[PDB]
Amino acid sequence: GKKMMTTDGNTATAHVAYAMSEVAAIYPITPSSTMGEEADDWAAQGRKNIFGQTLTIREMQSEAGAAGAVHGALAAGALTTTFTASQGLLLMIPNMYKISGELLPGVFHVTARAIAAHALSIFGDHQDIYAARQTGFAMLASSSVQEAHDMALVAHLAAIESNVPFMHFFDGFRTSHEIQKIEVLDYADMASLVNQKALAEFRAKSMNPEHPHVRGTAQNPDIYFQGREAANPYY
Amino acid sequence: GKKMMTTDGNTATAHVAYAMSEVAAIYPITPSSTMGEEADDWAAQGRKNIFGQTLTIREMQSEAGAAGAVHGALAAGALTTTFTASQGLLLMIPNMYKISGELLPGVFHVTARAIAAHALSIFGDHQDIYAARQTGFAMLASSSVQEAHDMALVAHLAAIESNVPFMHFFDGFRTSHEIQKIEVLDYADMASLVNQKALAEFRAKSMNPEHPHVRGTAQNPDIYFQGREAANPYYLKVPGIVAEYMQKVASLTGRSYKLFDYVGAPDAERVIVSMGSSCETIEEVINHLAAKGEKIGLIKVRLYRPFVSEAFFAALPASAKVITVLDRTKEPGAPGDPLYLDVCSAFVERGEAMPKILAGRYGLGSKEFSPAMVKSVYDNMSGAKKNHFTVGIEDDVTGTSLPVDNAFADTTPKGTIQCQFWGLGADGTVGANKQAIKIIGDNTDLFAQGYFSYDSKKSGGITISHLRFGEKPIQSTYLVNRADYVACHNPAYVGIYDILEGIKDGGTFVLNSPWSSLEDMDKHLPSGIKRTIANKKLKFYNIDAVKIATDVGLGGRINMIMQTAFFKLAGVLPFEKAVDLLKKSIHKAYGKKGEKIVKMNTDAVDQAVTSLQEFKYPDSWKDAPAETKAEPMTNEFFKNVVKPILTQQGDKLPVSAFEADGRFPLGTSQFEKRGVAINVPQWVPENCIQCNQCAFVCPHSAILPVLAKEEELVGAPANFTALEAKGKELKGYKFRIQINTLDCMGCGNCADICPPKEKALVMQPLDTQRDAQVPNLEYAARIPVKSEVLPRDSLKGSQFQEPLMEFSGACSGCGETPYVRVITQLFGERMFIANATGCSSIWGASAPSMPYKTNRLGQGPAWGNSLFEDAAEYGFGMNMSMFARRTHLADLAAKALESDASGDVKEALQGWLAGKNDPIKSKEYGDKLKKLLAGQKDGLLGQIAAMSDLYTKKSVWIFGGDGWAYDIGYGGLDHVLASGEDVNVFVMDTEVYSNTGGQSSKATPTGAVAKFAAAGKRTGKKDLARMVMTYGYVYVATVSMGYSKQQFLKVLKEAESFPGPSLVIAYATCINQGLRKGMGKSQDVMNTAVKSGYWPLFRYDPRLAAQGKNPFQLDSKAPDGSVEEFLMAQNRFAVLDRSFPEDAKRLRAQVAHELDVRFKELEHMAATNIFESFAPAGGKADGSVDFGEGAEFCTRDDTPMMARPDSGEACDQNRAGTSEQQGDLSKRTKK
Amino acid sequence: DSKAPDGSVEEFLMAQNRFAVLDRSFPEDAKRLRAQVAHELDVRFKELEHMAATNIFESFAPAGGKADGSVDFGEGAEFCTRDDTPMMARPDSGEACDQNRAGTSEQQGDLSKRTKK
Amino acid sequence: KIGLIKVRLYRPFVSEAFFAALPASAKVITVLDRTKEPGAPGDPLYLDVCSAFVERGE
Amino acid sequence: VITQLFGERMFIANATGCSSIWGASAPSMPYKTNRLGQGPAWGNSLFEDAAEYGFGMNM
Amino acid sequence: GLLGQIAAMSDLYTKKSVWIFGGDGWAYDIGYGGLDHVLASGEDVNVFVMDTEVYSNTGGQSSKATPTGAVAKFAAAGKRTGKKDLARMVMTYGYVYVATVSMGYSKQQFLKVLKEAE
């Protein structure tokens, strides 16, 4: 069940991310890099997620590349996350509308960092999460190392059940690199909270040539507005 | 000074952009493409900007590329713009923060277009501009063609003075493609308004090594917040500067604007706040309602950012009691849309009275926002006062929609002629209308507006034009719904579309058809049309336009006869004046020329006017009676959703009719059966050699090879002629090539390819073929497809497989579709397709038509379109999923080999495990597992049973055109191939950006004419193939169907099976290429492209390298010496020869030199003994080690970037010198 | 500009910890991949030598002058060069053309000839 | 007499839940934003909060 | 040494990375002008765009 | 006049030298599409890539420039794909000057390349 632990915001959230995800399409960017590096180390160490499997992490050529990959893994029925921040989050924006437009249970864990304008800053603020405000993602904030663990858990579980992609965020450095004595749950406790019927429905509506569908159609004025409004129920 | 002009929003703004800019870093995206192409054309024509120089326009690899270039041009002191929209604007966002943070006077001109979420739309809305809201750009909206001209001017001028970058936007299509008679300023007048001080200041603060500075520094917590806030002055000053130029331009034009503008009743109680073209229509409805007593008004927002509340309140009537804020966007989950949120802000900031603010959303993706919809917004303010509503749709899932009464009266100014024209694609209707507006606008003092609707179909598509003419300015930014004039130019529309909806009582309806006698017209006109005509007392006119066209020798071209009908009957102009104006225009214009063709045109005009007399229908049409159904069975979904959409009634579909994630079912095209071919092939059984090459080659899957044993031909129609099957394996069968006359597009590739000199296929008119072959095609469909009889990957054998991509909207003779149909014939039931945006995705899935279909077992291609820039990675993701999921199935399987599960189960489980990545063995055992595990719901076995859709090995394909592979998606493709993973990419190379209009690609060859390469491409074609062959572990091949169908199937078979990344590039013929004898020669041109050495064929198989064999295999022969003829037979090369002969000769000589050296290098590659080896894959082993483990010196630095949980231990940071230096120092110091 | 491999890769790699850690942690995999890198640079240098001794070259011409004039790809084409979609619609789009629905030039001329009436 | 409303779910913004956390006694309330949107009438959280109060109509 | 050969005439479009972090992480600016006040005009746009940032300066 | 305008342009008189600096992560990965398009352009720019064979600043993450068997983040058991050949890929253009340098081996080859590239 519970396990006491002194760690920082990044690892407290990577703890959950790993257990709740199957695939992860990654790109490094300060200050969320620790999350992806840990998930990769834990996969080499053969750590297992809630399905008893090591996570499939692959590094991309950019965060647009990774977001492109995250939308694909989700479309094909695998729980998927990614760890990013600021300039990286910006490159995931076109895909974020697609990931939410297609009602996919993705989860982004972002260490909210500043955007380069007059100067670049690897430091903490909400300029970036606010930039993805309009993408249709649910946004769940954390104000501490211990809440990073908890909101990371709620984000994953609710995205699976609701089908609305989530973006769990916490402050760059101020929370991601702050170490605290917290308490984390065990992977099994997390596994028990999962809505299996929602998870079975996710798999079933996914892309498979044995029961195909076409996604990403081009739409005219006659039907685009209606199609855009059809997701209201989920939100 | 002033110049009157009839143009669209794009050109009105490109006019100004060109003048005000020095540089332009560009990328094409619908609907802003026209602005960049025009600037490029004007730069070639020697047009000069206000500095006396032609603009420097360069096309980039993407809009992130262009924006990065725009930032650099500005930082280096040059006025710069760019033209973009939606997905494009999104890629510019990171640089927009940089551009504005660095206080650069950039100006972006965007045609506000929708964002791709559930589906992509090239249509108009504010989802994109609102997405760049936080970037620091100033935002200045336009609501009309005329305003686009003026706001473009204000934007440039203010950006220079204030140093805050600007983004001038106007609605996609609604304004950018609406044509209007406007007035534009001269470049000198613009030049006079420029603040020279600000300009010199701009030049001096710019990047220069002669007075350098550092920009783009990295900042810590100590100073970042202050530095971000230091630009506040400029943002405080920008609205005053905008207002300043709004006045300066107004003293030259006479058209005044404010940051926010009120219109309507001074003591209005119900006010609407809006932005964009919706304002024009809203003002037009106000004028009608207020004149009737209604206390209403509107606030037009010009400067959206900065939002200046003082300016907003300066426009708000004190009398306003209810006010609704309209947003042309949708931000899911937000407490309210952008403008609404801003307005709410101003009211609380005020701290006084709260008027009751309602939120409303409209026009997503060009949804109509009509007077009836505007009236409804106002009624809501006096009635139900429903909040967070939508207008223009029927929301029946979440009830957010406002009721709309379409019987609301016409609100267009008094004395406005409204006309509708229904044409066939490529019949000249649009061009004739555009010319009709030019003539009237230039020879009268009437206001003119023109707006056109097009089809998603590329060939045989419908067109519906909407024009308005009047003495009062036209603010009607909505389609014509109450017509004075309706023209149906294709007689076939009479029975399928609602041609007469809303035509005014007593309006005129002219129809092009040969149904001249009453008996004919009665027989061909639906009763619905007869009643309407009779009850609305319409002046109906019939004219056989094809006969007159032929009789005068114009050979059926009706453009000029229908144009004549309009000038004579539309009533916009006097008969005499119109025809005089008309004939002078015929004289002046014209395609080929000669005084003779001119004469045929003057003949058609006069032959038409004499035949243009009313068709005096009987009174009995009032009570004409309904027809009994004689239509085929269909889908519940085709019947319910797709058909209504196809007959143009899509807006009547409520929201419940669509899937929330936006998915569509495969195979909807199976019932379209448009029958738009003029000529379809006819099989001639006596000459057939039973080769199936006709079927293989069809761009639409319109030829059906039939192979049946006699007992299957029992209920076969008398004329279902079938030859005895030729073949060792095919003895008892009967063979018949069955033409699908209704799905055929009339291209000719098949007949052209048919081997016998005495052709087995001959083109014939569709009428001579349909009665016989429609029923035959119906019967032939019942015949089981003999997929087992011959090898799936043999020519003849592949055409005895079910094609899983049929009847798409691709153009007749398309060079792309034949390739994708046969790939499906080899792998269709196991494939995932990650399609890049482009032609591929437009004929692949533009709703409601879905060409991809499932086989008799319900299996087919899982198709998806993510974005233009990510196809490769979208597919790599699907593959990561199968890896993870199938790996999970394998662990389960390896575990269940320990349960009380039957021996049958375990043997099939070991089987599946043994050949899991083998498509044959994974299936052979996967199907056993499907049977043995049926009904199992509990335990390792129950979980395994729920994973049957993962048993057979899938085949991940990534499809894309050349622009995707060579430009925009290139970095991602390169990274995915570099991954070593099993994915297959199929690049259809048209050597140009096809779908968006022929823009230059890096795949475009030297000398080819295209947009952005308008005097011939001056850089050679990028060698993508050779670039990726440098990897050693990637299968690479080039194919060309017309040259070798068997090399193509060999490539497909060797690429799909390669346990790694495959890259197959195929030569795709396209209409943009200009094949001079038709697209029916595509197969022949693909042949010649190889034979001339233009497109050599080769294969690079890394697995041979692993056996000591040379992986590079050349499949085609040396240049035969026909490139010159090959090039000259295509207009993309031949136009230069006519226009710039001296240059053409050189570039064509260069292309020949190029392919000569290239074939030589290819031959050099094939003869080498030196080759990169290859090892299949690598197993997922446990264990990992950090790079800094056990190092002698520090392996990481003191910065926050390298800080990790376990960082911080003491180490030697290289400040004491080398190990040896230290050891020596130490020994020299003993003490 | 450089000479053929002097056979010291093994030493050059083992002198760096990015390579040496693997040898300590995963000895057989390290020996494998170090043998791979040596093989790769060998094949590569040979490929570079092949380039150097070649007689087949891609030519080059410096630049190109900013000349006046341009022509549209669809100018004077026999068949439709643009489709019926909103994407391809331009200010001067709209004139009548052969959209390839009646077959090849030859097919039509033949059909016409076979149909005199 | 001071307090704080901590936002966990930023999107969807649920006004009902925001007011569920607001003391009826609140008389001045300041909204803190960790961002800067140049020229916008106000930052994101501020705009959302102002929205909930006008929507309320109280 | 590159600046020792072309420094006075150069524009630098630098991509994000170590290059941009030792090149200009405030308040330290290693790039300097010569006795004649000439020197490299230095700028960092983004990580993904250096080539095109530099292409623009040249445009 | 014309002359006063020309005098205001003195910072433009001498030919400038546009350089593009970047590490391997930039050239081989993230900025690769753009680099490839800029060299394809045929314009006069010079790009200097400092190849550390890894993403240095962010903490040693693997790059496509990372050789086979090198230990880095995301290649923690040795990078299992060879080093991408950026040099040879761009040499396919024919109209792009491509060179490689290593100071420790030859300072004069390095000065030669710079002088020849610029």
Ligand SMILES: Cc1ncc(C[n+]2csc(CCOP(=O)(O)OP(=O)(O)O)c2C)c(N)n1
């Ligand atoms: C980021 C972005 N910018 C541009 C576009 C518009 N666009 C998409 S497809 C395309 C060109 C298609 O070219 P190609 O890959 O050759 O495909 P084709 O149509 O020729 O087969 C363009 C410019 C877009 N959808 N997204």
Ligand SMILES: Cc1ncc(C[n+]2csc(CCOP(=O)(O)OP(=O)(O)O)c2C)c(N)n1
């Ligand atoms: C779009 C984006 N994502 C990622 C980053 C974070 N990032 C900046 S530089 C860098 C790696 C630096 O690598 P390289 O180009 O090899 O330079 P080096 O430090 O090795 O000299 C990364 C991952 C960023 N700034 N922006």
Ligand code: SF4
């Ligand atoms: S004419 Fe073209 S579309 Fe018709 S069957 Fe032949 S190849 Fe197919």
Ligand code: SF4
């Ligand atoms: S191409 Fe001609 S000869 Fe061959 S199967 Fe078809 S109709 Fe028969």
Ligand code: SF4
């Ligand atoms: S690739 Fe060319 S011929 Fe094919 S659908 Fe596109 S525009 Fe038409």
Ligand SMILES: [Ca+2]
């Ligand atoms: Ca493969």
Ligand SMILES: [Mg+2]
């Ligand atoms: Mg193309």
Ligand SMILES: [Mg+2]
């Ligand atoms: Mg590096």
